[PDB]
Design a protein around this motif. Structure first.
Motif, short mmCIF file in Angstrom:
data_model
loop_
_atom_site.label_atom_id
_atom_site.label_comp_id
_atom_site.label_asym_id
_atom_site.label_seq_id
_atom_site.Cartn_x
_atom_site.Cartn_y
_atom_site.Cartn_z
N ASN B 93 41.10 29.12 59.64
CA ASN B 93 41.71 30.43 59.83
C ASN B 93 43.09 30.46 59.19
O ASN B 93 43.98 29.71 59.60
CB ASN B 93 41.79 30.76 61.32
N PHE B 94 43.26 31.31 58.18
CA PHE B 94 44.54 31.39 57.48
C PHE B 94 45.64 31.92 58.40
O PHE B 94 46.77 31.44 58.34
CB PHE B 94 44.40 32.29 56.25
N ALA B 95 45.33 32.92 59.23
CA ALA B 95 46.35 33.51 60.08
C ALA B 95 46.90 32.50 61.08
O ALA B 95 48.05 32.60 61.51
CB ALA B 95 45.79 34.73 60.81
N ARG B 96 46.08 31.53 61.48
CA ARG B 96 46.54 30.50 62.41
C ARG B 96 47.66 29.67 61.80
O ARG B 96 48.74 29.55 62.37
CB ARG B 96 45.37 29.61 62.83
N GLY B 97 47.43 29.13 60.61
CA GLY B 97 48.37 28.25 59.96
C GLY B 97 49.53 28.94 59.28
O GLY B 97 50.32 28.29 58.60
N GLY B 134 40.94 26.33 52.93
CA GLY B 134 41.07 25.91 54.31
C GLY B 134 42.22 26.61 54.98
O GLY B 134 43.13 27.12 54.32
N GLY B 135 42.17 26.64 56.31
CA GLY B 135 43.20 27.31 57.08
C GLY B 135 44.56 26.66 56.97
O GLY B 135 45.50 27.25 56.42
N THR B 136 44.68 25.43 57.48
CA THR B 136 45.98 24.77 57.50
C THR B 136 46.51 24.52 56.10
O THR B 136 47.69 24.77 55.84
CB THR B 136 45.90 23.45 58.29
N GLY B 137 45.65 24.08 55.17
CA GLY B 137 46.11 23.84 53.81
C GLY B 137 46.75 25.06 53.19
O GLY B 137 47.94 25.03 52.85
N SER B 138 46.00 26.15 53.06
CA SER B 138 46.53 27.36 52.44
C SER B 138 47.71 27.95 53.22
O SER B 138 48.73 28.29 52.62
CB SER B 138 45.42 28.40 52.29
N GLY B 139 47.58 28.06 54.54
CA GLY B 139 48.65 28.66 55.33
C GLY B 139 49.95 27.89 55.30
O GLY B 139 51.02 28.47 55.05
N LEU B 140 49.89 26.58 55.53
CA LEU B 140 51.10 25.77 55.50
C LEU B 140 51.65 25.65 54.09
O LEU B 140 52.87 25.60 53.92
CB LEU B 140 50.84 24.38 56.09
N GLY B 141 50.79 25.58 53.07
CA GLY B 141 51.30 25.58 51.71
C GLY B 141 52.07 26.86 51.40
O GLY B 141 53.16 26.81 50.84
N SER B 142 51.52 28.00 51.81
CA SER B 142 52.21 29.27 51.61
C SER B 142 53.56 29.28 52.33
O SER B 142 54.58 29.65 51.75
CB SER B 142 51.33 30.41 52.11
N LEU B 143 53.57 28.86 53.60
CA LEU B 143 54.81 28.89 54.37
C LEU B 143 55.85 27.93 53.80
O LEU B 143 57.04 28.29 53.70
CB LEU B 143 54.52 28.58 55.83
N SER B 178 41.43 32.11 50.37
CA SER B 178 41.75 31.86 48.97
C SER B 178 42.51 33.03 48.36
O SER B 178 43.52 32.84 47.68
CB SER B 178 40.48 31.58 48.17
N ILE B 179 42.05 34.26 48.62
CA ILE B 179 42.72 35.43 48.06
C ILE B 179 44.12 35.57 48.65
O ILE B 179 45.09 35.86 47.94
CB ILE B 179 41.88 36.70 48.29
N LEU B 180 44.24 35.37 49.97
CA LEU B 180 45.55 35.50 50.61
C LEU B 180 46.53 34.45 50.08
O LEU B 180 47.70 34.75 49.82
CB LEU B 180 45.41 35.40 52.12
N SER B 181 46.07 33.21 49.90
CA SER B 181 46.94 32.16 49.40
C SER B 181 47.31 32.40 47.94
O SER B 181 48.43 32.06 47.52
CB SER B 181 46.26 30.81 49.57
N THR B 182 46.39 32.94 47.14
CA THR B 182 46.74 33.31 45.77
C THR B 182 47.82 34.39 45.76
O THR B 182 48.77 34.32 44.98
CB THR B 182 45.50 33.78 45.01
N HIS B 183 47.68 35.38 46.64
CA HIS B 183 48.75 36.35 46.85
C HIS B 183 50.07 35.66 47.14
O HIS B 183 51.11 36.01 46.57
CB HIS B 183 48.38 37.28 48.01
N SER B 184 50.05 34.68 48.04
CA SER B 184 51.30 34.07 48.48
C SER B 184 51.95 33.25 47.37
O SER B 184 53.17 33.30 47.18
CB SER B 184 51.07 33.20 49.71
N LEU B 416 45.70 41.22 43.14
CA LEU B 416 44.68 40.67 42.25
C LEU B 416 44.26 41.68 41.18
O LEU B 416 44.05 41.30 40.03
CB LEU B 416 43.47 40.20 43.02
N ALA B 417 44.13 42.95 41.55
CA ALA B 417 43.82 43.97 40.56
C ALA B 417 44.93 44.06 39.52
O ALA B 417 44.67 44.19 38.32
CB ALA B 417 43.60 45.32 41.23
#
Ligand SMILES: Nc1nc2c(ncn2[C@@H]2O[C@H](COP(=O)(O)OP(=O)(O)OP(=O)(O)O)[C@@H](O)[C@H]2O)c(=O)[nH]1
Ligand SMILES: Nc1nc2c(ncn2[C@@H]2O[C@H](COP(=O)(O)OP(=O)(O)OP(=O)(O)O)[C@@H](O)[C@H]2O)c(=O)[nH]1
Ligand SMILES: Nc1nc2c(ncn2[C@@H]2O[C@H](COP(=O)(O)OP(=O)(O)O)[C@@H](O)[C@H]2O)c(=O)[nH]1
Ligand SMILES: [Mg+2]
Ligand SMILES: [Mg+2]
Lengths: 160, 430, 430, 430
Positions: B93-97, B134-143, B178-184, B416-417
């Motif tokens: 879960n991306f929102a979790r991390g 993954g949740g923690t990977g993408s979320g913590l990387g973004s943060l 993946s899309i949310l982390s690409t945004h970040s 993305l657009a």
């Protein structure tokens, strides 16, 4: 001693808040005392729904359903999970606006005032009598004369 | 007096960090205990007497991988309190991390980053590794990227993200995060390198002739690519390249910094020595579409700029004689507004071999980092996958209930657009 | 860390637990006296998931056993591994429910549940980091289906953020042992959908079919059905107790298998299963495991999975194997069966790998798939319920303990609404 | 020619004195019999031929602990008639040990103190240990301090008091005597160090990974802190610090001398050697709020002055490079009227390990003694606890009947109010 009108109300609201904070079923093992102290000073969604249910607000109309209250709670709660005393007051004001939403002629202030009259917050004894638990006993593995015995001691009184 | 700090977050990040840290220790002669029985300074630090400490930090909310690290043969190498571990996993879960459990851990990581940075005097930049799906990977990387972009500012950060394969997938919800982390990381990272697993599986199958590969074989190739990229900072070379000399050569515009890599040669000892491995043939193999490290076809788009590193006994004249041949070919065409697009680096140290591994020992190798217009296909297919489930709002309740707002999904779609429109706008000739 | 407690109720749940705990103890090498006698180091690293520690070095399960009659717990204590259970956790009444849902949920179950909730609260407050609860009970009995489901609501009210598992045996119309099964099945399904985070249906008819056709043993007994259910139960949490390539806790499965909060009724299956005489013929390979995993007769439910389309699927591989083969086989099982997979959610199969196989087996797979074919069970249950209710048969037993027909009407309506809205997505198209 | 005398009174005092006296004997090579099989002179005295006698005195009214001491392995070490013992315990009553039974014992203790002092020629000062939440400990400590302050005058006395935890408590009446003893030692002790048990329990749990600690584990850490504090008097060092060089550096005003300590590193041999234990990381760990030896949050207040001791192979330039990093951080802020607040000491002798103990052997360690404005919270909470029961005059009859006057409780309350006002007045910026 005395308290302000919003606060006397504020004092009674703080008493309700502190009561419902202690009703939380905390899930988990081996807590820190800091976490226990924190959880005693915040209300979760379940205890907030319990408050609304005991005060006969929950599910009374389409704007105060379990789902609508959950959405409102997540929107106005601290960390999306917890209400402190200030956020609890804000949530009650938001619930008052939702509960009386169909009454178009009422201002938001009059909706909050109407909710405070509906819960009888100005009368501490009637307000406190609506407080209900969740559950505890004092750990004691439990299970003709049960009816209670009020031993009225004889006044060894001024005449006696 | 030149340093770099590598950040490893998530299970995939930690498992590729292990892979790169056997290779670096082997390449600099340091035993697994950390003791030698002046080039080490880029990745390591001297403690005054004896052991060396890596300039790396391991992050994860789920403790299993860190506990495995802290009991293996490398237990003595890493500092005990830079392997930050959580208790509860984000569970894809991306929102979790990003909102719930990552915030309470990010402060310790930032404190560790400060404590490592104050030691360095010539900090070149940061490296970060994270599996995106993954949740923690993408979320913590973004943060972490968002915190670092404001704490330090102009320092360069490089991201070796592993996007999901076109059709092969392990999760079912990975397009969303993946899309949310690409945004970040679109507006927060200076370089992003594509690393999807399917292309590397095909590489192993075709060249290494392994029919049953595991994750370790993939991570060893990624580690070799990292070593080839960073060799120029710690070894003498006839034509050096620094990390800061990238956005001036591979990044035409601030938005466009996603590029895909390739490596050559990849061959086993059983048939490596039967052929001469000349520089021309390896530089031809590196440009083959089937040897891309990401499953994208370069024949479907133009090239923008190619940065490609050599190491070994290669001579510059042989490199020029091979760049000319590639410019000659009709199947590879560059963009109109770029007459020359090659940046060449030459290093003397041959690639090192890891015992018990797949690759053999060779005297010449080439690693290319190429920015091309064809990368838009992965964005288009990820967008198509995202739209199918976002039409019915599936799996959204798992994200709305973790503090994220409803509208946060739409703006990632709009970005993305915008990126896809920008890639089309750049690739048209004048 | 991230451990769970065990709570079981009723006779069927107690018999399931009596084999589940034996299987767990045999897996971790714990003797029936609570003394560790294992061989591998990994057998003790994550033993805190299910077992507590006491003085003298022995281990005690954190299980809570409840029933309205003392016979079943007085019998399970004399069985093998019966001494592990703490005597304090045994709570029972002196009357029983007599397969009457009202008695086990309104009159008798309400007064007793305070004592069991006390010990439940004691167990949960103490533990390091809670992951959640798992519940085993039967929907064909009164005391079980009443007290267990009311306990579900009571636990959910106090721990809204934790995860909740329920392994529920629903009464099949083929092998019927109680005439009042439809009433307490329909009443229980009403409450179960509102509070359980995950539900896994198991049918005795499917277990008999499996035992007769795949294992081909002459005389099935409850011990074999319990053993199969226990193996399936253990397979789900294996990677949470052992290292692996891709760890995946229960919350990660919850994220990836539940698209909408009300669709959380799964059917499971275990592979491999072979007869004694053919255990030497077969060779254990990933294709052999995956072909049996998706076999229709291998499901633990009589529901026919080719009568509907899978919303999503999950697989938990065990043993040491290559990930590339697993991913390609998952892709192949999804390309050759595109008609039985819903089309508006692409890549709807989740995979996980754990490096520790079951004792005695080199490879094993646990399958958890959310499919639309489960509607048939609720259809037949509601059909029997409405056939019996229209004449008000056996209704006086329930109505004599404070219950009314309005709660029956609401339960029937909600169950029919669930049936309808579960198939609503079967005909949905993009 | 430099000496120090340590006073141990009460059960907690004697049990921590035992803990420090194994450590000193081990550190100076003296066997438990007192025989060696010029640094000893600080704590010991030479008898002319053979054994060494500690410069310590043990006090208690309850004979059990002293009898345990006089029969253990250390029976031959201490002089037989400096283990002063009473017959009747004070039983947690402060008035008893200050007015009733302590007066008849205090004369013998003062005679022993004189007999020990006449031997020393360069007496640096006194050390005293006493658990505050007890009758005999607090009462006799108060009486001894009051007698010593007038018998000797300007000699320095240091108090290692153990205040009760915020919520965890063993007695029910300990706030009363804690407040009275704080009153007594406020105007009579030069230094007081905070030592409540809850913080050290958390330290053991988090770092030492012990889930069931006992008092010995706590006392060993306290003994290590004492050894680190007094190492500079008996070992050669590049930057020495004496006891008399404290009130000039840590005590801004005569009233304010309560400070809280911390120690680093704390780590077990199972994972100590996997990380390099650089000076920067240990000095970062020492300033972590979770590693305070008293359960107080330094983030809630300003710092006044920090005195922090190193020992091992640390180099001063590395210390300066780490003090700069701490001054850089935004989460640690000093008071306005203190531009520099650090006093640094460096010693060469590494900390010694006790066999069978918890801590491992390391080459670098840091011990900090920090005076901060945040300490007022413990006073406020103790005051709140005191007021609740003093409102109804509970438990007062147990004190009035032991010779104490009624008004003696009020003036301690007034002095605590004065101290709290003073702490607020000092912390405001100009
Ligand atoms: N190349 C490569 N990719 C991996 C590896 N391990 C996992 N992945 C990828 O990572 C994706 C999922 O993220 P993970 O790294 O496994 O898990 P995570 O990032 O820690 O996120 P959580 O699930 O919350 O723990 C999968 O789709 C895999 O493709 C690996 O060892 N090598
Ligand atoms: N840190 C630490 N504290 C202790 C220890 N033993 C007792 N205490 C503390 O001391 C407090 C009570 O005082 P004690 O030392 O036990 O008894 P006392 O000081 O001799 O006073 P009396 O009760 O009259 O004998 C308790 O609240 C404990 O917290 C110990 O071994 N280590
Ligand atoms: N798998 C299994 N099922 C059982 C066992 N014993 C009973 N059952 C099932 O449980 C159902 C009856 O449940 P019941 O005993 O009345 O539950 P209770 O009311 O809670 O005691 C029957 O339909 C059986 O199929 C057993 O040992 N194993
Ligand atoms: Mg993970
Ligand atoms: Mg005592």
């Amino acid at each position: 001693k005395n308290l302000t009108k919003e606060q006397i109300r504020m004092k009674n609201l703080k008493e309700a808040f502190n009561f419902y904070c202690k009703q939380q079923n905390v899930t988990g093992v081996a807590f820190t005392f800091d976490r226990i102290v924190h959880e005693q000073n915040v209300i979760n969604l379940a205890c907030f729904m319990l408050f609304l249910k005991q005060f006969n607000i929950l599910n009374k109309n389409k704007y105060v359903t379990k789902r609508e209250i959950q959405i409102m709670f997540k929107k106005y709660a601290l960390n999306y999970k917890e209400l402190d005393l200030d956020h609890f007051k804000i949530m009650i004001e938001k619930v008052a606006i939702a509960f009386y939403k169909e009454e178009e002629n009422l201002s938001n202030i009059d909706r909050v005032e109407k909710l405070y009259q509906y819960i009888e917050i100005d009368n501490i004894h009637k307000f406190r009598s609506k407080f209900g638990l969740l559950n505890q006993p004092f750990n004691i593995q439990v299970k003709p004369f049960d009816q209670g015995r009020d031993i009225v001691l004889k006044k060894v009184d001024p005449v006696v | 007096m030149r340093e770099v700090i590598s950040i490893h977050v998530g299970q995939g990040g930690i498992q590729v960090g292990n892979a790169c840290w056997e290779l670096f220790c082997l390449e600099h002669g340091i035993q697994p205990d950390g003791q030698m029985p002046d080039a080490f300074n880029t990745f390591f630090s001297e403690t005054g007497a004896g052991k060396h400490v890596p300039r790396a930090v391991f992050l994860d909310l789920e403790p299993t991988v860190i506990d495995e690290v802290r009991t293996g043969t490398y237990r003595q190498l890493f500092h005990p309190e830079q392997l930050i571990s959580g208790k509860e996993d984000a569970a894809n879960n991306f929102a979790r991390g990003h909102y719930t459990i990552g915030k309470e851990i990010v402060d310790l990581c930032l404190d560790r980053i400060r404590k490592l940075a104050d030691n360095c005097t010539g900090l070149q930049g940061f490296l970060v590794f994270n599996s995106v799906g993954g949740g923690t990977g993408s979320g913590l990387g973004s943060l972490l990227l968002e915190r670092l972009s404001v704490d330090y500012g102009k320092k360069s950060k490089l991201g070796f993200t592993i996007y999901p394969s076109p059709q092969v997938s392990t999760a079912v919800v990975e397009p969303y995060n993946s899309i949310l982390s690409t945004h970040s990381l679109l507006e927060h990272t200076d370089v992003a390198v594509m690393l999807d697993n399917e292309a590397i599986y095909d590489i192993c199958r075709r060249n290494l002739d392994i029919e049953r590969p595991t994750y370790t074989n993939l991570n060893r190739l990624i580690a070799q690519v990292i070593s080839s990229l960073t060799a120029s900072l710690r070894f003498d070379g006839a034509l050096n390249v620094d990390i800061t000399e990238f956005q001036t050569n591979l990044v035409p515009y601030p938005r466009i910094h996603f590029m895909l890599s390739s490596y050559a040669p990849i061959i086993s000892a059983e048939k490596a020595y039967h052929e001469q491995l000349s520089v021309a043939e390896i530089t031809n193999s590196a440009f083959e579409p089937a040897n891309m490290m990401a499953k994208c076809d370069p024949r479907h788009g133009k090239y923008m700029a190619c940065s490609m590193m050599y190491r070994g006994d290669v001579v510059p004249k042989d490199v020029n004689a091979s760049i000319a041949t590639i410019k000659t070919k009709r199947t590879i065409q560059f963009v109109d507004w770029c007459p020359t697009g090659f940046k060449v680096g030459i290093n003397y140290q041959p690639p090192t071999v890891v015992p018990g591994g797949d690759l053999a020992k060779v005297m010449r190798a080439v690693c290319m980092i190429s920015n091309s217009t064809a990368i838009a296909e992965v964005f288009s297919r990820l967008d198509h996958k995202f739209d199918l489930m976002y039409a019915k709002r599936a799996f959204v309740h798992w994200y709305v209930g973790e503090g994220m707002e409803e509208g946060e999904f739409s703006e990632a779609r709009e970005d993305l657009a915008a990126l896809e429109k920008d890639y089309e706008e750049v690739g048209i000739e004048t | 860390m991230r451990e769970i407690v065990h709570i079981q109720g009723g006779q069927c749940g107690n018999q399931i637990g009596a084999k589940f705990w034996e299987v767990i103890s045999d897996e971790h090498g714990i003797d029936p006296t609570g003394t560790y006698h294992g061989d591998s180091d990994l057998q003790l690293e994550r033993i805190n998931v299910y077992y507590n520690e006491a003085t003298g070095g022995r281990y005690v399960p954190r299980a809570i056993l409840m029933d309205l009659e003392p016979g079943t717990m007085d019998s399970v204590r004399a069985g093998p591994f019966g001494q592990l259970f703490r005597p304090d956790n045994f709570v029972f009444g002196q009357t029983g429910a007599g397969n009457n849902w009202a008695k086990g949920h309104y009159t008798e179950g309400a007064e007793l549940i305070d004592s069991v909730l006390d010990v439940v609260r004691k167990e949960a407050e103490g533990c390091d980091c809670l992951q959640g609860f798992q519940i085993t009970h039967s929907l064909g009995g009164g005391t079980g289906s009443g007290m267990g489901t009311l306990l579900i609501s009571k636990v959910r009210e106090e721990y809204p953020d934790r995860i909740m598992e329920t392994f529920s045996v629903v009464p099949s119309p083929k092998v019927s042992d109680t005439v009042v099964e439809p009433y307490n099945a329909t009443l229980s399904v009403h409450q179960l959908v509102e509070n359980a985070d995950e539900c896994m249906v198991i049918d005795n008819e499917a277990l008999y079919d499996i035992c007769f056709r795949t294992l081909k043993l002459t005389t099935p007994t409850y011990g074999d059905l319990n053993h199969l259910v226990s193996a399936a139960m253990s397979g789900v949490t294996c990677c949470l107790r052992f290292p692996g390539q891709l760890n995946s806790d229960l919350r990660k499965l919850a994220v990836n298998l539940i698209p909408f909060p009300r669709l959380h009724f799964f059917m499971i299956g275990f592979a491999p299963l072979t007869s004694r005489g053919s255990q030497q013929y077969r060779a254990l390979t990933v294709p052999e495991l995956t072909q049996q995993m998706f076999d229709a007769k291998n499901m633990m439910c009589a529901a026919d999975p080719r009568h509907g389309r899978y919303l999503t699927a999950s697989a938990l591989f065990r043993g040491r194997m290559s990930t590339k083969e697993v991913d390609e086989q998952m892709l192949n099982v999804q390309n050759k069966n595109s008609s039985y997979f819903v089309e508006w959610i692409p890549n709807n199969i989740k995979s996980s790998i754990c490096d520790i196989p079951p004792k005695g087996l080199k490879m094993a797979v646990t399958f958890v798939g959310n499919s639309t074919a489960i509607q048939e069970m609720f259809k037949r249950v509601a059909e029997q319920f409405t056939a019996m209710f229209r004449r008000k048969a056996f209704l006086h037993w329930y109505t004599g303990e404070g219950m009314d027909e309005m709660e029956f009407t609401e339960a029937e309506s909600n169950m029919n609404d669930l049936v309808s809205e579960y198939q609503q997505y079967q005909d949905a198209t993009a």
